Amino acid sequence: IKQGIREVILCKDQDGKIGLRLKSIDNGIFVQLVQANSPASLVGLRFGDQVLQINGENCAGWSSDKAHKVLKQAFGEKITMTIRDRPFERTITMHKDSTGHVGFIFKNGKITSIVKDSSAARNGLLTEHNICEINGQNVIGLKDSQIADILSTSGTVVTITIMPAFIFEHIIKRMAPSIMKSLMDHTIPEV
């Protein structure tokens, strides 16, 4: 998680889309969904990122509807956005033990217990937190077994990005699980 504000420049695709849905939270605007293979993914927007400005105008106080409308009405040749990086999230680095475990239990992507004497215990992983990313890869909407599988196929060093569940549950309201599973970018970013 970068302690930064960064500028991104976007271009609507040939369908006039950027591949973004946005959500009003605490009088800011946050990214609720980034579509795979979209202008938003390509420029590196992530679930939970805060949008500070669009085209030099402050997003403060905007409703979700107003943010969507602003994007629709932008001359989509060059849209500038000022982003603060995933401000409700934190990243925790763990090491798999000899048995290949880091030491927690989760359910519906939410961490529910920390295993004694684990790497998770040593690094202070918290319960009541939703898993947003593993090793920089968005895992939101994937099944527990797929998240398990990613953890298995990772190396020893496992980086997890988490968000307090009450904030996660606020961000994802009015978005169908099937959309999150099917449409949220789960790819590794391209170079």
Annotated binding site: 108, 143-144
> DSSP letters along 70-88, please?
HHHTS-TT-EEEEEE--TT
CB 54 within 8 A of CB 67: yes
Give, for 157, the enclosing helix (H) or strand (E): strand 157-164
* Domain match, 78 and 108 both: no
Among 173, 19, 170, smallest CA distance to 81 is for 19
Q: What determination technique applies here?
A: X-ray
Q: 56 and 100 share a domain?
A: no
What is the C-alpha separation between 45 and 29, in angstroms, rounded? Answer: 13
Cβ atoms 54, 70 nearer than 8 A: yes
Among 39, 57, 84, residue at a domain's last position: 84
Give the contacts of 145 (CB within 8 A, at least 6 positions apart): none
Cα–Cα distance, 95 to 11 (Å, whole number) = 40
CATH code, domain with 63: 2.30.42.10
User: Which residues have CB under 8 Å from 99's CB, separation 6+?
Assistant: none
Number of domains observed in the structure of the chain:
2
* Residue numbers of the domain that contains 146: 90-183
Give residues with Cβ within 8 angstroms of 15, minimum separation 6: none
Q: What are phi and psi of 91, to 5 degrees?
A: -120, 135
The answer to whether residue 190 sits within a structural domain is no
Distance CA 156, CA 144 (A): 20
- Same domain for 130 and 60, yes or no, is no
CA atoms within 13 A on the CB side of 59: 31
d(CA 169, CA 157): 28
Beta-bridge partner residues of 104: 114
Q: 138, 47 in Cβ contact below 8 A?
A: yes
Q: How far is CA 28 from CA 25, 33, 101, in A?
A: 5, 16, 38
Q: Which amino acid is at 68?
A: H
* Helix (H/G/I), strand (E/B), else coil: 160: strand
Report the residue count for the chain. 191
Same domain, yes or no, for 58 and 111?
Answer: no
Q: Among candidates 160, 186, 167, 175, which has minimal Cα distance to 88?
A: 167
Alpha-carbon torsion (138, 143, 149, 151), positive or negative: positive
**46 and 68 both lie in a single domain:** yes
Whether residue 100 sits in one domain with residue 66:
no
